[PDB]
């Protein structure tokens, strides 16, 4: 690629050829018409009652797509129904995968009429389909289906099981002092002060999939319970994922819908660091469900500023931030763990 | 798919030893390969794995001797194992992960006997 | 790590009687559970994934059931060629580990 | 930053905020000005580094040869108005850039003489003295390598890709062995990544495999790449990397081949070379097991002009490595010719 | 062609196709290669002008002393496969580059020997002789500058701006003295213009008038600037260009300012300058009618360094005309020193 | 300043700062001076004894069609008895002799429609009975000195204050790179090329003016007659040897009150032009294709160089001045009635 | 890895006296060679690092040469103080690995 930039700072503009990763925290092309048809059927006749999204990418996808699924597995006499639902965080993972169909479906290229059999995407439907029962991770971007100029990606069913995030939507560089791991969902920021460290996190999904190593920096040397995203919600296994004096969060907020990492103390509260305060735990918001704000806080032996993350619904403490005389039994807690 | 394992013979402790696993039906590239071994008389034990995208993992046992790795030209599989112990003497499988993150094809197994 | 263990440690019973194995965890690996036969002098044989899931060519005579920590694998109708050792193995995180082995005898 | 990309197919523009790594290699550096922290300071250090028994500098790069050539003449004057008895003596830099085991110490005070910055124009010129500091050139005689510093300066803020902007420096603290970070830019985005620094410009793709592409290096430096800045750190063996890690080169699954092991002897006396896997023209490789096993790195064409046809390897892999230099095409370790024997050909003698 | 601009205060791009113009001044020309018309063609001419009478060449521009540094090695080696006494010497630049009577003969038949392209990789250095034609140099001494060529290559194609293309050039039949109009562009927009070469980059605007802007020249070249690229060339006078006609300045009303006239006595023997109009630091300019008459071109500074302060011209108009050389101020012919007799500051000693 | 481009024919691509000219030949949302300073010079001519306004280019009548129902609220609201109405434009446009005045002050009461009046304020239109060209403004305003630019979209333009005939320099652009060359504006598209001495290439105009090219926006103004440039002077054709094509004159009888013309030296379709020394002299220019769709195909010139003139009319193909038939009379034929 | 041998495995002499230690690798390192003295119950302590620069402190009857793979290791006026073992290590690459080490006794 071509390209010019700027620095605001300084007021310098240049110009060349080079690797860009842009900020991104779209027509998708299933498959073919007649052909996931066919792969639904299969599954549907295979024992796989349902769907569950890697991330909202492919719900978005689903969501495109259902109307003329649903048109195609009528035309074609099949009695099955396609419902989408929305999407609840954390997205875990499934243990089926979908067939690749030998051949496609006779007749295809109107509505559809609603069936007694369902095929339930991501939704609120885990008694008709639990968890045990559906497929995850079955897709796969084409070989020049994502670009910069795109805005249409193609994507086709997988032939093979795996656990990795899809690497071709992944961009990581770093710069000098600063750095980046980025996708489609993730924009993870990190910097060297004294040590390189993690400086901010954007997050609007939290997936299950894992981050690929070989878009990884620094991935030698490293302790899966240092990471501060842990790398069961496709953290990065990564020196620019820690921060000194905390472990690994498998206890934060990850139910939200758009989480937003930083270190620096929640509007209105203080935190000092103490050697009788108490163990860590859950994670716990600063206001109380009346509203009343906390105000006294302490930590055995972090590092200021502190971790907190910003909802839309509060500002949450890291696992290692406790009250310290308050009660923290009437405080709010966090009911999901990584 | 076939699986044939072959380099296994005996050795004295403190030697070294290189296992071979060979694939029919299918390419080494596509699968998620691993080794598992099963001592005289005892359990199953999961040694290393080696992800389809190129990424291993090892069990805190074998961390830092053993070593897995793939030759795509020949679609075979290889297991280096260095400075062996007297724990280390088993049978040897080549197995493949699949659905539910679970072993479906099995080799036929190869023994390793470390004694002087 | 995660330890499992398996009872009972060995079973005894005649043609077309029932059998059932208990596995037990000792964490939260719900629902990612596996079990295998291991007939002596030959490679352990997938029947059970996703501690339900039929693995296919599998005879139907094999049942799975639990979820969290308990787990049960059923035989209804007893064989002559269904006398082997059977584990179960975690799928939850690595390392992967299996269980102590069960004997089914006579 | 803020940029924006263009495609020329369909004349438009992508624009947004995020990381840029741009193409630096092959051009110009002597279009900077360049400010070591200060002439007192760096006069000092000097002076002190003499008494001690270092002679002289080994560079890095070719940034800081620049960079000395630039200050040398503000230097000797600021060295004289203060009665010292030194000169500072700049040469040219010739490939591979061997190491020193010394360091440019940090003085406690600069001199109490002469003005406070860098580029102040008309001053007499220095006269010529006995005593001289040779900055690397072809001068292993005087002073040898055991005796040179290496690697002492730390860069603090630069602009590199603007071509009248400074560049700040000062003289770190501590040994160290790694390459500066503040001039080294990676990035992967899909099946394509890049390793590069003012120097180097190393290309991956993803066949079944990931695999070195292409390189282009237009010096060879002796530090080592820091891990910091390099993908896919883990589980790689430091026998296996294409381009030495003695040479700078990543310790990455990105710089590898299959087929192919560390090329310890190819041609790095070359001011300038470029890896590519094709043959060279008017040549053919076979793939035979009766092949010799490998060795120096040989040239395609004789020393009287004549090209060789024929060549082998044993377990190579189609396209053969080769090396372009401007005398021309060279081949990896692996492949050895087929009939005419050694003896008749142009083989490498320098070892990372 | 077609192409694309950028905003940064609001990122985003404007596209269409049309007329670009860039600023290609001080870039390195050496990373292109150079076809002159042929070996064997080139061979024979030079052999004939050595038949003829001419001693060597004087370049136009620095783009043609890097083309024969590209070419002297194979045209020696061509020159020697053919028995021919005769070596090509190819030396430095210095400005002003002044001009030769001579032109280059075009020969009839070629030497019937050699290879038929450029870049045949590997020859073998040839053998020095007693006959020279000498490329311009240091060399004003073994042959005038009556018995040199001047202005004999044409270019035919060109890819100036990529940094691995060629350019193909061609000894031209007849007599000119115009500059080559194939690398010239010119543009205007508004109230900004521009008159541009490989080596010039004269800007102009729109005040009450229009008028010249700042100049930046990295050489000063003795040809003809074409009529066909100028803007405005009707109704104007030889003598008010600020830079004159004889140094390739564009005869144009873009090219002049109020209050002063043609500066053929400036500091032209600089290797590279830049022409402002504002003071110099640490001096000052007053308009008084008492001051002294034009004449040659001063410096700020004084030979020791010492800066000159008060200034002064008769009807110049402020911001004053200075260059902005390598050694410092210099200001125009208009501008004289209040105070300090003339013969205790350098001035230029050239004229055009 | 900066940005990228490409050579699709090296298919090469480079970056980096200059002076780029684009083809623009809808956008731009238009500001006069203001909404109360507009209406009091209106006011003011119109007391003066200026009937209407005769525009320059398609830019003036745009902003006059955009601006003329909010000028007529403010004029109707503050209490005087004149209406704005906006005709079309017919080509070419001709010049007028009067110029608005500018108000010493605003009108006081300004910042719903208005109703017909009696007073017409005519601009541009086919109203040349109630308002003559003899009492009409002309070139009566300035683009504003930012008022224009690549990224702009919103030109701000202001009353002029004195008497100019020369067309806005804020809006021309040229450039000559190497063999190629080109004068422009908003209007105009003007070619050239070097083949053995620099000559017009081809030309493409939507809309024809009469003001007067700037020289200081003109590449090769001197040793240049006026009865050489082939696009007459008249219409705002610069005075430059980059206007000129050996073999023919200026063409004052062209096809001017087409409405979208596009000059290019090849034969219009199923014909033949010879040079003869036996044919007739110039004059008005001819139409290939007659009244009744019948295509004329024998044409002859006495001494003009191939390939010929021809002018690609929306509606046609005319020739050139000096080409003419050989057997059909040309009383028969389509002529031009209009003259620079 | 590089194998680092040294000769003799002891060496007497009487104070005043010249001794003389002999290190090689099985490499070439040509100038990445430190000389270390060891007293018993204490840490070692460098003496020559390069193969031949004194470290800051201590006295100048210590002296080193050599380059390739052959390296020596010279004391002038032997002290009641020079009574120790002295190792050799290599610092071209990783692993740095030491010598097996030479004793000086009295006489």
């Known amino acids: ?338 | 798919v076939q699986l044939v394992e072959s380099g296994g013979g005996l050795i004295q402790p403190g030697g070294s030893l290189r296992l071979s696993c060979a694939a029919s039906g299918f390419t080494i590239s596509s699968k998620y390969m691993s080794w598992v071994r099963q001592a005289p008389g005892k359990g199953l034990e999961w040694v290393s794995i080696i992800y389809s995208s190129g990424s291993t993992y090892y069990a805190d046992s074998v961390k830092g001797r053993f070593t897995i790795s793939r030759d795509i030209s020949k679609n075979t599989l290889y297991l280096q194992m260095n400075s062996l112990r007297a724990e280390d003497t088993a049978v040897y499988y080549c197995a493949s992960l699949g659905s539910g993150s679970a072993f479906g094809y099995w080799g036929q197994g190869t023994l390793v006997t470390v004694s002087s | ?106």
Request: glycine content about 8%; overall charge neutral; some cysteine.
């Open chain 3, 1 to 106: 790590d995660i330890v499992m263990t398996q009872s009972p440690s060995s079973v005894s019973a005649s043609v077309g009687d029932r059998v059932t194995i208990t596995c037990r965890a000792s964490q939260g690996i719900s629902t990612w559970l596996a079990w295998y036969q291991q007939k002596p002098g030959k490679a352990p044989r997938l029947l059970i994934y996703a501690a339900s899931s039929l693995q296919s060519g599998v005879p139907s005579r094999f049942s799975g059931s639990g979820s969290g920590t308990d787990f049960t694998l059923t035989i209804s109708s007893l064989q002559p060629e269904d006398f082997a050792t059977y584990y179960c193995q975690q799928a939850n995180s690595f390392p992967f580990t299996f269980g102590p082995g069960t004997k089914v005898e006579i």
């Open chain 1, 1 to 338: 690629h071509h390209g010019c930039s700027v620095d605001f700072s300084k007021k310098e503009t240049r110009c060349g050829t080079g690797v860009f990763v842009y900020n991104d925290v779209y027509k998708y092309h299933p498959d073919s018409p007649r052909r996931l048809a066919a792969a639904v059927k299969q599954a549907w006749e295979d024992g796989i009652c349902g769907i569950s999204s890697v991330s909202r990418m492919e719900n978005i996808m689903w969501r495109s797509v259902e109307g003329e699924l649903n048109a195609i597995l009528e035309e074609n006499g099949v009695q099955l129904t396609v419902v989408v639902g929305s999407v609840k965080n954390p997205m875990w993972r499934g243990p089926q995968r979908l067939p690749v169909p030998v051949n496609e479906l006779p007749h295809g290229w109107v509505r559809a009429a609603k069936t007694n059999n369902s095929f339930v995407v991501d939704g609120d439907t885990l008694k008709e389909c639990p968890l045990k029962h559906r497929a995850w991770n079955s897709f796969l971007v084409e070989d020049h289906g994502f670009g910069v100029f795109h805005t249409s990606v193609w994507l086709k069913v997988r032939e093979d099981y795996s656990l990795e995030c899809d690497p071709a939507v992944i961009g990581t560089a770093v710069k000098g002092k600063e750095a980046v791991h980025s996708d489609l969902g993730y924009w993870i920021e990190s910097e060297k002060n004294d040590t390189w460290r993690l400086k901010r996190a954007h997050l609007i999904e939290m997936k299950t999939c894992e981050w690929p190593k070989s878009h990884t920096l620094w991935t030698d040397g490293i302790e899966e319970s240092d990471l501060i995203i842990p790398k069961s919600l496709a953290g990065p296994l990564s020196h620019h994922n820690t921060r000194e004096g905390y472990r690994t969060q498998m206890k934060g907020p990850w139910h939200s819908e758009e989480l937003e990492i930083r270190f620096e103390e929640c509007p209105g509260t203080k935190v000092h660091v103490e050697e009788t305060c108490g163990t860590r735990g859950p994670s716990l918001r600063s206001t109380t469900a009346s509203g009343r704000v906390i105000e006294e806080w302490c930590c055995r032996e972090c590092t200021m500023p502190p971790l907190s993350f910003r909802a839309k619904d509060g500002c949450w403490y890291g696992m290692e931030i406790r009250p310290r005389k308050e009660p923290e039994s009437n405080l709010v807690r966090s009911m999901v763990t990584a």
